[PDB]
Every structure is written in C-alpha cells, then in structure tokens.
Amino acid sequence: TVTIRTRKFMTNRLLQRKQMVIDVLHPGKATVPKTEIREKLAKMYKTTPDVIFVFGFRTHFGGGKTTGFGMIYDSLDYAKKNEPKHRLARHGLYEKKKTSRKQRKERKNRMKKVRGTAKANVGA
Template identity: 55%
Template sequence: MSDAITIRTRKVLSNALLSRRQFVIDVIHPNRANVSKDELREQLSALYKVEKDQVSVFGFRTQYGGGKSTGFGLVYNSVADAKKFEPAYRLVRYGLATKVEKAARQQRKQKKNRGKKIFGTERKAAKKAAKRASD
C-alpha cells in the first residue's frame, strides 16, 4: 500500500442549500488494483483541511485496464451538516450512526396480512395487546 496515488477533483460545485462542496474525484493508482474509500477520505480531509467525518466518497468505478478510478465526493461544512444530509446507510458505514435492526420486508408484510385474518372480539384483543406492547 506504499504505492503513490494521485487525487484530482473536478467539477467542484459549492452547494449552499446542503452545506457542502461536491465534486468528481479522479484517482490515479498505478500498480494497485484500487484505493480504499477510507484512505481517500483521509487524503481529501487533508486536502480540504477538514475532519475526516465531514468527507463522504462513493460511486467509484475503476477504468478497464486499471490504474484509474472515478467517483463522487462531498465535503460538508461541519460534522453536524454531514449527519443531517448524508443518507443513513453511509453514516453507518463511516461509524457516525448505528444501524436500525428490523424484521425483513417479507416478514413485515406477512405479519400485516396475518393480522387481516383475525375477526371480531379476537381482533380487538389483538389490537389492545399490540398497543400495550408498543407503550
């Protein structure tokens, strides 16, 4: 991993509404398959003089033949802005949020449809039990 890499940003745009700078990143990495996003975040944070948590990178594609990758980068004005505007899954990747564990989509739908089959007083009892469980 000691091989040198070159990072170039282009199409830099300042997005005041989302409190960030956004750009396309070209990474030149000869003699390497690719560069980790974590390493890119560190280098971009040094380049833009911000904390690593304010930088987000994604969407990288390595060119055929290797040696060059292109992706997208965001540098937020503050960590709070990053937490406010970044998608939850990226915050989880970067360790800034915890993943919300919930039942699988199909299981949630099956539970909903099972509930539709309960009739009469049994349904009232089931609703009361569900309400007590949620409180």
C-alpha cells in the same frame, strides 16, 4: 504514489456541502479503499475526515485511474441530517432494524385480524 484530483467542483449552500468528482491515479496497484481517499481529501481541503462521504468508484479498464463522487459537509450534524442513511452506515453512525420485510408484512397482516389494543399482543 496515489494522486487524487477533484473535478466538476460545486458548493451546495442548500445542502451545506462541497460536492466534487474524485479522480484517483494509482498505476500498477489495486483500487485504493475509501479510508485512504477520505484521509487524502481531508488534508487536500483542510477538513476533518468524519464529514467527508466518498462513493461510486468505477475503475477504468487497464486500471491506472478510478472516478468516484465525493462530498465534504460543513459539520457532523449536517452530515447526519441530510445524507442517505445507508452511506452513514459505512461510517457506523447509523444502525437499522434486524427484521427482513417478509416478517414485517406477515406481522402487519396478523395485526389487521385483531381490533383495539390487542394489535400489540400479535408479537411478544
């Protein structure tokens, strides 16, 4: 019984996407996960679910309505080109470095000590 409407619809020809406001009615039951939103937006606009990036849902008080922002890209390469790399990482097709920034700071400051090729000899 999950209805999903689209609102304030736009076509960015300059970012190669559709972008719209997803409006999910689901009275009685929990906030529905993004996977059910993507799969319903997919068959709503007759597109692959892989090009659909869906985020920023804040459920109204009472909870028979959530409003989030969606966008449907033209291709897979267009998705991976001009999308925030963190929102790719919800789909597993961006992985970032394990290091926390304090190691990278202290590394940089240790490399500032030695001159020449010996800066590679700070770590390992």
